[PDB]
Amino acid sequence: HSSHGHTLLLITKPSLQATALLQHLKQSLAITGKLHNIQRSLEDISAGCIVLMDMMEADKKLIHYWQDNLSRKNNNIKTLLLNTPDDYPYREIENWPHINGVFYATEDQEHVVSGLQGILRGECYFSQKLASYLITH
Amino acid sequence: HTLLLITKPSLQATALLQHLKQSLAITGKLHNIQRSLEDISAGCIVLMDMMEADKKLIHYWQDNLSRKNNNIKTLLLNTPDDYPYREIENWPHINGVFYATEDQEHVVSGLQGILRGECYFSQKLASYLITH
Ligand SMILES: [Mg+2]
Ligand SMILES: [Mg+2]
Numbered sequence A: 001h002s003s004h005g006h007t008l009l010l011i012t013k014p015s016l017q018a019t020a021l022l023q024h025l026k027q028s029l030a031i032t033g034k035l036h037n038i039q040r041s042l043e044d045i046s047a048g049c050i051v052l053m054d055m056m057e058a059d060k061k062l063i064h065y066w067q068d069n070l071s072r073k074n075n076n077i078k079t080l081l082l083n084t085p086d087d088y089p090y091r092e093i094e095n096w097p098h099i100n101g102v103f104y105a106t107e108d109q110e111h112v113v114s115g116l117q118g119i120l121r122g123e124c125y126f127s128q129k130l131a132s133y134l135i136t137h
Numbered sequence B: 001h002t003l004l005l006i007t008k009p010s011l012q013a014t015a016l017l018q019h020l021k022q023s024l025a026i027t028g029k030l031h032n033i034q035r036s037l038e039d040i041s042a043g044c045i046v047l048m049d050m051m052e053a054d055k056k057l058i059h060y061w062q063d064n065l066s067r068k069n070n071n072i073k074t075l076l077l078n079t080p081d082d083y084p085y086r087e088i089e090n091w092p093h094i095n096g097v098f099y100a101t102e103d104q105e106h107v108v109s110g111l112q113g114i115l116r117g118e119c120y121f122s123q124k125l126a127s128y129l130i131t132h
Helices: A016-029 A061-073 A089-096 A108-120 A130-134 B013-022 B057-067 B085-089 B104-115 B123-130
Strands: A005-013 A032-037 A051-053 A079-080 A101-102 B003-009 B027-032 B043-051 B073-077 B094-097
Touching: A005 A016, A005 A089, A016 A032, A016 B013, A016 B104, A051 B085, A079 A108, A089 A101, A089 A130, A101 A108, A108 B013, B003 B013, B013 B104, B043 B104, B073 B104, B085 B094, B085 B123, B094 B104
Parallel strands: A005 A032, A005 A051, A051 A079, A079 A101, B003 B027, B003 B043, B043 B073, B073 B094
Antiparallel strands: none
8 A cells, every 4th residue: 555656647638527537546546646648748757657548548649659758667657558449459558568457448437446456456457368468478 | 407428438537427426416427529419308417528529519519409408508618718708608508618627626516506507607708798
């Protein structure tokens, strides 16, 4: 349960609803967090960051941009993909640096809280089939 | 009264809808801004997500919401804030405009005002609407 530790970085289109989701995750997880505009560059990324990368706001350019500059880091960070297309290819997921989970659900907040509680415990959030793909390799 | 959040479907949109439903004690639904809508029940409070609206979609939603059940209320969500007053005025059944993308409590308080029959406009925008 460390605060230094872990912090949420929600990278998406800034919106009232993104704020509502971030506040809900912060309160449910008892963690600090911030929202960052997916279309804006970032220089300062804290060490414990759990990046929630909004795939519905990402195109090929932004995927490349966020893959490129997050790989420069670590900095001990974890990337989880949010609002992920069904059938986003496994080959593409693997190419994300520091990839720790994939969220598909657009309706089940509780699903997502539970997954993030796992990440705080050192667990990834992958289906059995995707974890197997990633492990082997 | 029921909430009709018209936006791009996303986990965060569901999170906001749930928070508004729970804060206001009303039912609500999410509708994809890029899809047509047939039936709008009476007493709907439409939250129209301006960040997901381009000029074709504004024209579409202005057109079909002015048809289809004049017993509705429209509020603009995530409004750019230099959105022109004359544009706001052209929305049918316009009852409020939210600019804040960070202050949920502001917005809840505004929607509880709308439920009491109040509008949610800045003083200057209200003055513009009244004297038009
Ligand atoms: Mg849809
Ligand atoms: Mg406001």
